[PDB]
């Protein structure tokens, strides 16, 4: 399997995980006061998505990064005992769980 068919691999499982929902889309500021003045580098996974179909991976380790980048903002902006938080932990096992089955 080629490293981009794993990623979009990977990418599905994530999604599929009941805590992907807050991360699915662009955030909305209006009901995220600041998040982009707070957030440098916003990311989610429709543009992960759509970065990986557009061919703008050139390697592993830039979606890794884009994904590890993802849950920094979330925890970063929501706090350490947030909703969110809590679920940015679950989906981040999720996603080490998928990189180890698909980039053994
Ligand atoms: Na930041
Ligand atoms: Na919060
Ligand atoms: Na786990
Ligand atoms: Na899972």
Redesign the pocket.
């Known amino acids: 399997d080629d490293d981009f068919t794993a990623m979009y691999k990977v990418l599905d499982v994530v999604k599929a995980h009941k805590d992907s929902w807050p991360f699915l889309e662009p955030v909305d500021e209006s009901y995220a006061p600041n998040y982009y003045q707070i957030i440098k580098a916003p990311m989610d996974i429709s543009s992960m998505e759509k970065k990986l179909n557009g061919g703008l991976y050139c390697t592993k380790e830039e979606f890794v990064n884009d994904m590890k980048t993802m849950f920094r903002n979330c925890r970063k902006?929501?706090?350490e005992s947030?909703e969110?938080t809590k679920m940015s932990d679950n989906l981040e096992r999720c996603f080490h769980r998928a990189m180890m089955k698909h980039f053994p």
């Open positions: 902006y929501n706090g947030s969110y």
